[PDB]
Amino acid sequence: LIERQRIRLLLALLFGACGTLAFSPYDVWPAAIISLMGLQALTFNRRPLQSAAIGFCWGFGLFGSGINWVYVSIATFGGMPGPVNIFLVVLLAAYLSLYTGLFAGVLSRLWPKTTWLRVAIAAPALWQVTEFLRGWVLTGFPWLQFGYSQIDGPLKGLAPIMGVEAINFLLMMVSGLLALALVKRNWRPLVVAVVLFALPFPLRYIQWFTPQPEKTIQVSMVQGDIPQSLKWDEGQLLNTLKIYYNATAPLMGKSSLIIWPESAITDLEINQQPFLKALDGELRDKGSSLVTGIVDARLNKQNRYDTYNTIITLGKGAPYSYESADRYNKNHLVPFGEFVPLESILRPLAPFFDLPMSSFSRGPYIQPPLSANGIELTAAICYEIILGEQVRDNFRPDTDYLLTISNDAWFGKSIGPWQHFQMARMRALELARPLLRSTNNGITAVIGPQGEIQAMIPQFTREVLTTNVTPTTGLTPYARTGNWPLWVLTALFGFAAVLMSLR
Ligand SMILES: CCCCCCCC/C=C\CCCCCCCC(=O)OC[C@H](O)CO
Ligand SMILES: CCCCCCCC/C=C\CCCCCCCC(=O)OC[C@H](O)CO
Ligand SMILES: CCCCCCCC/C=C\CCCCCCCC(=O)OC[C@H](O)CO
């Protein structure tokens, strides 16, 4: 028989890479089940170290093929030779692949026999703990979670109840039973798998929200398409400010809310006071509000400058003040982009090399929703929208819309900005709120309360997306409880499965 560990590692690579087809650009949702079926079936009847090796290679295919878009960021930021960046991409993919090896290795140790307890009970619970660590250890990088591939799929109804991680759970469960049915040539796990998969379908029709048409507003989002910063001089700041203002001016009397993307204003907040105070007056005059990203350096009590990635509000119902509490400061910073890991390497800084000291500061985990024109917006900047629990914790029942401002000009023309967009849609469906995503170039859109794309403008263009958005009010089960029910389910599955293994 050709079942040999060399073959299994080769197939793990292909079934892992197959998982990339499930996500935003390709959107083949059944690829998630086939992907997880390979991981489930290939680890059958293996030593714990052989299984861990197969789990690693599955993760290497998935993350190698689907996360490789980070290269362009490493290339332009890191300042490294070409093959060094390639090595660093292989490094990152390997790091994430560890958690998949850990999953397979632990699963094979406690549940070596190929049984429905292994695939249906132990696997989903362990996968939950595994995938939790991947997105937690260090800052965490929970990219490529197959739950997001169901945003338009049959399992979308599960999301507003138990959240996206419940779709991760059920998919690992259903894929496990199918791998068992195939390997053991037994139709019974197939029937259960189909039933477990089909039952959540009617839930996609439940509306846990209700719209508020009397609050319908016309919202505008300016896609500035301002290029990467090659030279910062007052000539580029004046060009940027002109582009954004000139696009906002004709909308001042019509659109109740105007949004500019992440770090849209390319100068410090303290250096723009005349501009902003004058812009706040013009908006209040015509009865409009502006929400724009800006980089804000702020003197601490210690008299040291703390630089924030901010969101500031202007206009009607949001009078601009540098001391205003109506602002959002980014919390979760990109590990190598916005801060430096291991700041304690300051010893080689002064003697020998020129080491980066440049690092952003973090805002609070919980922040009140931005108010503009009497509209409540719970903001998340860029990467932060992929963090399900953080967005839910900040979410308030009076929130009218979810707000994301991002700058994806890096990773442009790649799968990355789409995978990012796909996870932003998940937030709207989970919380039953419209989501307003204004970016610099990549994927400016409006997403309804069920995750449907309401309006969208093409990438890499200089445009304004103006459309009517009506807010929603009610509370979903996930918005109340969060992922506590899933962790309760995961505990009961792990309790049973470990108790069964220990007997
Ligand atoms: C030891 C029983 C507990 C199992 C817990 C495992 C946890 C491993 C997690 C990640 C490592 C993934 C990297 C894969 C490296 C394994 C390859 C290997 O070492 O296999 C060589 C084998 O000894 C040749 O016969
Ligand atoms: C996040 C919400 C998703 C959670 C969903 C909760 C569903 C759990 C219910 C039952 C477990 C399924 C176990 C079914 C076992 C399959 C039947 C089977 O395999 O029996 C044939 C056997 O091979 C011959 O001995
Ligand atoms: C002996 C080897 C053991 C191997 C283990 C494999 C199976 C793991 C099973 C269950 C993990 C239990 C974790 C459950 C903890 C519940 C966490 C919780 O209360 O939720 C936090 C909250 O929801 C945040 O927002």
Residue numbers in the entry: 6 to 508
What does the paper say about this structure?
Seleno-methionine (Se-Met) labelling of LntEco for Se-single-wavelength anomalous diffraction (Se-SAD) phasing was used to solve the native LntEco structure to a resolution of 2.9 Å. For purposes of the discussion that follows the focus will be on the wild type LntEco construct. Lnt has two domains, a MD and a periplasmic ND with 230 and 278 residues, respectively. The MD consists of eight transmembrane helices (H1–H8) with both N and C termini in the cytoplasm. At its periplasmic end, opposing helices across the cylinder’s diameter are approximately equidistant giving the MD the appearance of an open ended cylinder. A strong interaction between highly conserved Gly145 in L1 of the MD and Tyr388 in the ND contributes to holding the two domains together where they meet at the periplasmic surface of the membrane. Cys387 in the ND sits above the center of the MD about 13 Å from where L1 crosses its cylindrical opening. The closest distance between a side chain carboxyl oxygen on Glu267 and the γS of Cys387 is 4.1 Å (3.5 Å in LntPae). This is too far for direct interaction and suggests that proton abstraction may involve the mediation of a water molecule to relay transfer from Cys387 to Glu267. The heptapeptide insert forms a loop that clamps into the cleft between α2, β3 and β4 at the top of the ND.
This transferase N-acylates the Cys* of the apo-lipoprotein using preferentially phosphatidylethanolamine (PE) as a lipid substrate and generating the triacylated lipoprotein product218192021. Lnt is a member of the nitrilase family of enzymes with two domains, a membrane domain (MD) and a periplasmic nitrilase-like domain (ND) harbouring the enzyme’s active site. The active site, defined by the catalytic triad, resides in the ND slightly above the membrane surface with an opening for substrates and products that leads into the bulk membrane.
